[PDB]
Design a protein around this ligand. Structure first.
Ligand SMILES: CC(C)S(=O)(=O)N[C@H]1COC[C@H]1Oc1ccc(-c2ccc(C#N)s2)cc1
Ligand SMILES: N[C@@H](CCC(=O)O)C(=O)O
Ligand SMILES: N[C@@H](CCC(=O)O)C(=O)O
Ligand SMILES: [Zn+2]
Ligand SMILES: [Zn+2]
Ligand SMILES: [Zn+2]
Lengths: 258, 257
């Protein structure tokens, strides 16, 4: 049968082609995860359908209703067979879905508007003039929520009670907030997305300091799915054959504008 | 009692200065010694650290198809788990299970300071400076299997080089760089390279970018019940910042250069 692939509109992972309206099915999209999905399916020998996650979310469990939203929810509730997206491997998610070995490394990082007097998470935590936040329903927000590290707990105490909200609905909203806030907003996001934006016009943002953590994106499947084993072996093969390195260069650096 | 196979490789597992008056697990120290203690505490098991008998990581003999090293100890039922700088590879994942990686690394170049080499391309385009890798390891297999022009050229040279450019242990490779007056460069994992760069006599250096990007995983026999719990422990330890704390403790807080 045709494998239902859940994914998310996040640059440069998955984007609508400029002429998408004249195209059909998988042909409407382009990006790192579109190329990776095609390679995994070809190596595993399956037909697939890319579907954009209905709620536009990565995946979090609602504290009250206990329902998973986002791509994680699409896998948990049987709406999709596999997630091929910049989906972070986390302990809470691994308890409900399976992940392949990581296909890409990343860490939480700081995005500033160029010229902002901030060099680290410690600098953000020790001041009040520059506001800062994260994506409202992903792994970055959960990292701060759960952190027992002094600087990060201090950052979370501030973010959770900041008014108006420092949290954003999408990466693009966070980026637009940095760009329009004249250096008064810094955005906390994954190093991969931060490095991509730093290489795009208007070239007015920058990644500053080291990463706050070290983790990876994994291809996700429903718990105990038969696809899990084959997909993990495909990620290992593609890494060893240099495909993953070739795709990162194609989507980040080969088409850099700065 | 869980039998843990591991390897004497700095700063992962090392005999303590006073090992002779110490017994069992207490004889050893290092990143993987601290990691084994953390995993066992979180998973609730007793364990015995045992050093791999042949001193190898693990490769399959082309003729007999027999696995050696820590991989072989798991395959043949001699050990329950491997907690070591054991590279996750496709050929190994076909015979043993690996947790998600607990540490990242790439193949890198070690030179004696002042050696006129900046990259793998520089090594491949000359003959004055010899270069090699560790035997029965994933670095050697990377060059053996590579279809990338520079790396295939490097392998063609290394496989036929006389005298041999390959070494039995990392320490032998490091000692060869140090004694060869800049005429030998060693190809090894960035983790081991960065550790040696921070140790006396401070005469080596990591040069250029990494040739690949991969990780070390905790390994168990295929279908072992321990695999699931150990993978969850690695994810928890990463999230708590314990993996970062151990890397800092063993590499940079213990810096001599
Ligand atoms: C054999 C490979 C498929 S792999 O599983 O090693 N993944 C590689 C594919 O691209 C790059 C690398 O991704 C990684 C992504 C994340 C990590 C980390 C784990 C724990 C950390 C800490 N603290 S950082 C390692 C490797
Ligand atoms: N990759 C993240 C989304 C982005 C973020 O949280 O910064 C996730 O899987 O939740
Ligand atoms: N970590 C490697 C050994 C070192 C090397 O090959 O450079 C392995 O697991 O085989
Ligand atoms: Zn392919
Ligand atoms: Zn602990
Ligand atoms: Zn033989």
């Amino acid at each position: 049968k045709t494998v239902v692939v859940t994914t998310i509109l996040e640059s440069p992972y998955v984007m609508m082609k400029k002429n998408h309206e004249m195209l059909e099915g998988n042909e409407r999209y382009e990006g790192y995860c579109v190329d990776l999905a095609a390679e995994i399916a070809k190596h595993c020998g399956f037909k697939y359908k890319l579907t954009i996650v209905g709620d536009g979310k990565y995946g979090a469990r609602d504290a009250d209703t206990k329902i998973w939203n986002g791509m994680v929810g699409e896998l948990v509730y049987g709406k999709a067979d596999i997630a091929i997206a910049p989906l972070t491997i986390t302990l809470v998610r691994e308890e409900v879905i399976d992940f392949s070995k990581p296909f890409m490394s990343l860490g939480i990082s700081i995005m500033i508007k160029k010229g902002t007097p901030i060099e680290s998470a410690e600098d953000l935590s020790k001041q009040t003039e520059i506001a800062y936040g994260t994506l409202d329903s992903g792994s970055t927000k959960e990292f701060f929520r759960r952190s027992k590290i002094a600087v990060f707990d201090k950052m979370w105490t501030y973010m959770r009670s900041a008014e108006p909200s420092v949290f954003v609905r999408t990466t693009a909203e966070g980026v637009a907030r940095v760009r329009k806030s004249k250096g008064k907003y810094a955005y906390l996001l994954e190093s991969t997305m931060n490095e991509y934006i730093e290489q795009r016009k208007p070239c007015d943002t920058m990644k500053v300091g080291g990463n706050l953590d070290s983790k990876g994106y994994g291809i996700a499947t429903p718990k105990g799915s038969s696809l899990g084993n084959a997909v993990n072996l495909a990620v290992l093969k593609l890494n060893e054959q240099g495909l993953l390195d070739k795709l990162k260069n194609k989507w980040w650096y080969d088409k850099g504008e700065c």
